[PDB]
């Protein structure tokens, strides 16, 4: 059976049906949003129904007696008319054809395509120790009814509308070349004797939930002892619209038992799996969704297209392996550190249906840690 | 002259006298309810007379005491005995002492205090297009007689009782929050330029009937014209017991005559006065009383005390200034959203200040005309 | 008739530097090179090398009491020639060098350091109390210094054997510009659907420091409202574009008429403004071409970005605009203010198309500079 | 036993006794000078004996003197009660007998602490200092036209006013610096922290250094100095910056790597063979002489009446491969201020041992 996600307008006049909550960006192209709108023909007499796709970067959170301060930048806007029908969305998909057969004669198709110049779903709420405000890139599918005179007077009533926050999720391209090992080495001279650190990953692209085998090779020709080896996956977040906020957070860690004594060498392989489920604390890190939602993951690596200014991605997300070595003194000791970049995203994608309808409303997590509840949807009693 | 509000029981046995219909909550403290009960000593022979103060949230019906009411939650209950006389039977307040002198020997004082954890008078009856039901927080002063039977069942006849629906009205505290200020900017799709809106209010607390000067600064760096600047006072109502009803309603609105052309800025002050008398439709909005009553106003902002669960307020009322900008060729072309920002403020009654001659009057509130 | 030559001696008297000017002209097409000489005491430079460097650097940050120390430096250009022993590093001579060598004798060696085309001009500011942002600037340092055999190897080039001059790179207009359009704009402010028309026009686009700017203002009032007040300002806009995105906008000239434009009437008025540092006691919070304490210091010229140069390597962007504010009567205990900008450029005039007097390279202090934070004392102390 | 410092006038008529050579300034207040004067009653018949406290700045071998404070009390003939203020005075009067008179001279809050320097050969600038003189002297009159102050009837002690720490200290010193070298896309980042804002003379200073080298160049050397900065602010604007401690890390920082390291420095006069050209709290020849403590300027007091400003800073210098001569002619360095002073102070008839005031030579 195919799970179809539905949401009804407060006034029951407009219901939107979608095939998925999450649309795949696989670099080469992005999955379009094909769905249908069921109208109550009594409540849309003399009305037009449209569906818009909006991608917007936003910045700012409501604080108690702190100056209200928000920024919004629309990165994409598109709109088709769905009722009365005029085939604005062009030729149909199989999904639309089947949904129209299953739902009956008041069901009209819409298709909204994504262009190639957009980021994927990225948002964060700051942790207490972070300066910077809540920011994110939202993707809104909105079905709404207008009257003759309603667009003229900036009154498109909220009770006749229904908005879905879909995710644009980063998957790896269906064709990519075979994978170079991601490796580097450093020589740290200490009294002109080298401490050599090599760090090697099996490959450059890992999938969310995939173990990352980090091989660490310490050749210690110095008089000093490596007392401690820490290996982290760090997420680096650069906000590149409105405010140049910087976050760097550990999303996986192993701190080895190993010492490397003078005039000796040690090779060690640690497996790390960078996962949002690794910390109770879901604030201060780039997510692909809300802290409170169960289906929310770490944000994928930003993929900037040739000729696209990085600033229109809104939030840059990158991942790195950090290796920190604690080297003995005496009476106090030094730490050297190095990074190896890698990219984290979802796997390569794949190549008359029976339908089960379900609320487009993501399940909450039992335990999300501390978060700030955002502004409640203002689609309440407004007349 | 001091106006004293009286109501007599159907059976004439019990009369309650109150100094006011409305008791002041000024955050720091709440005015107690000091009054007296006049008994007919013939009709209360062998009887006990009490006065109760009840605060209750109700949902589904207009009063707390209605047949098959969907939901009642008691927020506070207190009761004192007035007859037979308790101890000294002496007055606590000057008002009681004077009323007892004016009314004679069958007059007994009562004092019922309010605690600090209660909401103020809030109720709404829905408008036709609203889905939720009537709900409210009522404050009942009830004087009633009990008597014994031979079968060991005490009786509280309705004919020996008298109930007054008093208001608990929110007056301002000693202090207020910082000057409310909001800054919002939008970059439209295919624009390189921001539309900037700054909003400030003169202060954080306004009084019912007080003009709110909303100062608006539009910096329009875009190619587009701001065709309209609308300033609203929105009342936000959250029912937080029984049913999660949500109302946002315009209780005042002003449309600037000025447009803001491309590559220009406009600073302007619009004055709004959120008032129940402004709104033909008195349903679908949080009031401090019944629609039919003349003395009824907009509900004051809820003030939640530290450590008190918001749910025992029953109905949360807040106010905000909404400034909405209509931008030429935007809606339908480059967005399907509003261009708007909100600034919270609080609306309540003024701060309070720091042998009398009596005129008696039926407690019943005057109807509107 | 005399040429004034600027000299400075090293603390140890081993090296003296002579320059033709304190200020070198950027006229967009080309930049005046720095031609001077170094007089050495041949006793004190026995077995030594003497070099002269030209450094252009953007710097950010000021010394604050109990506030975390936080500095950024970016070198935008570095060049160095050897001046002693002579090797003709600076190439063939100028007339000035030849004459100075004749006047000063046999221990006098020439240097020539050229400027490239991709640099900003002298721009710096110290913030005013109400400004957030720290001290920042673009400095041009000419430094003559002596090294021993082993001195560059060990990062010890002794300060007592060195001498640094902070020269200015001053923006002049180019010699042969095409004829100039008027800088003009007009706005229609609808008020109850009746137009208030404001036209603002300058005689040309480029004005010289000290040149009167004739601002013509034309108010056509077809509204029911009265223009109560007209303010005309020259505003300096400063954008820091390295390290921190600081923003300054300051009035550097102003005329406010009380004289009114009633309903159904129109008024043209021509005001002269002269944007000058001399207009305010307060020299902080504005882009200068030099230190607050120095008398020869002026307002910074308009930044001139060359095609294909990233604006960020200019360090501090300085622009000028005419601001017109109209106070328009309302319905009322207050009225509305509309404001508009017309950009123009401010720089020094086009350039023109010996007997020597020596003088300390040390700019004269101003009698009254207002409040400033004195910078860290020059580092020419007993080391 | 309590060591009491004494000095007798040439003519043996006046002996001054002090509890200490060094009086504590702990910012909140300054220890008063409580002592006694023993007179030979035969040699002071018809005479008056006074004790003065003088603070003066001097410059030259005298090129310039500026008096910063003067106070004087009468000790003989006895003033009023003639009773002790302090337990020390009361006990000294009991131990020394009936010709012993107490004096108390207070310090105000607006004075510097003991600071002086003699220049090194490489320095221009002359000897200068702030001296504190306790002087007991006799006046007398053989003739109505004048009183006379014979030098043979006087005795002067050069006391130190030593800076001890207050109740509080500033926030943890931290500096961050970054450099983009000409033609490098990539920053060299240096973070420096100290454990705290006030260190005591002889106390190890742990300087934590974090070098983030995102450049293609190697940091070949990390040098950490304690620099003493001296500004003479009366008569002549002499400026001294001198290294009073230095430590060179063994570690290089290669391209595209970071190193966090703590170097421990102890700024001490005993580190420097050369004791000239640096602000001391006393004479070079004296054993008890230390580095001058940080000047502490009080709100509302003009820094010029401190005479000599002394400050301390940590300098961290990074030597970068293929830089000096090729891409810069400048040093790569940052500074972190801190304050250096003596520890916070603490809060049956005592047993006394008398000793010549004169400080022991090295």
UniProtKB/Swiss-Prot annotation, chain A:
Keyword Acetylation: yes
Similarity comment: Belongs to the arrestin family.
SMART domains: Arrestin_C
GO molecular function: G protein-coupled receptor binding; identical protein binding; opsin binding; phosphoprotein binding
Any GO CC annotation of this UniProt entry: membrane
Assembly and oligomerization: Monomer. Homodimer. Homotetramer. Self-association is cooperative. Isoform A and isoform B interact with RHO (via phosphorylated C-terminus).
Entries under Gene3D superfamilies matching the protein: 2.60.40.640, 2.60.40.840
Signal peptide region: none
Protein name in UniProt: S-arrestin
PANTHER family: ARRESTIN (PTHR11792), S-ARRESTIN (PTHR11792:SF15)
Function: Binds to photoactivated, phosphorylated RHO and terminates RHO signaling via G-proteins by competing with G-proteins for the same binding site on RHO. May play a role in preventing light-dependent degeneration of retinal photoreceptor cells.
UniProt KW Metal-binding keyword: no
SUPFAM superfamilies, per the entry: E set domains
Modified residues (Phosphothreonine): 222
Record GO biological process: G protein-coupled receptor internalization; response to light stimulus; signal transduction
Keywords, comma-separated and alphabetical: Acetylation, Cell projection, Membrane, Phosphoprotein
Expression sites by tissue: Detected in retina, in rod photoreceptor cells (at protein level).
Gene: SAG
Upper lineage: Eukaryota, Metazoa, Chordata, Craniata, Vertebrata
Pfam families: Arrestin_C, Arrestin_N
Entry's free-text remark on domains: The C-terminus of isoform A interferes with binding to non-phosphorylated RHO. Interaction with phosphorylated RHO triggers displacement of the C-terminus and leads to a conformation change that mediates high-affinity RHO binding. Isoform B is C-terminally truncated and is therefore already in the optimal conformation for RHO binding.
From Swiss-Prot, chain B:
Keyword field contains Thylakoid: no
Consequence of changing residue 189 to A: Abrogates tetramerization, reduces dimerization, does not affect binding to microtubules and to phosphorylated light-activated rhodopsin
Record-level GO cellular component terms: cytosol; membrane; photoreceptor inner segment; photoreceptor outer segment
Pfam family membership, one: Arrestin_N
Known tissue expression: Detected in retina, in rod photoreceptor cells (at protein level).
InterPro entries in UniProt: Arrestin, Arrestin-like_C, Arrestin-like_N, Arrestin_C-like, Arrestin_CS, Arrestin_N, Ig_E-set
Coiled-coil ranges from the UniProt annotation: none
Domain of life: Eukaryota
Subunit note: Monomer. Homodimer. Homotetramer. Self-association is cooperative. Isoform A and isoform B interact with RHO (via phosphorylated C-terminus).
Protein name: S-arrestin
Protein source organism: Bos taurus
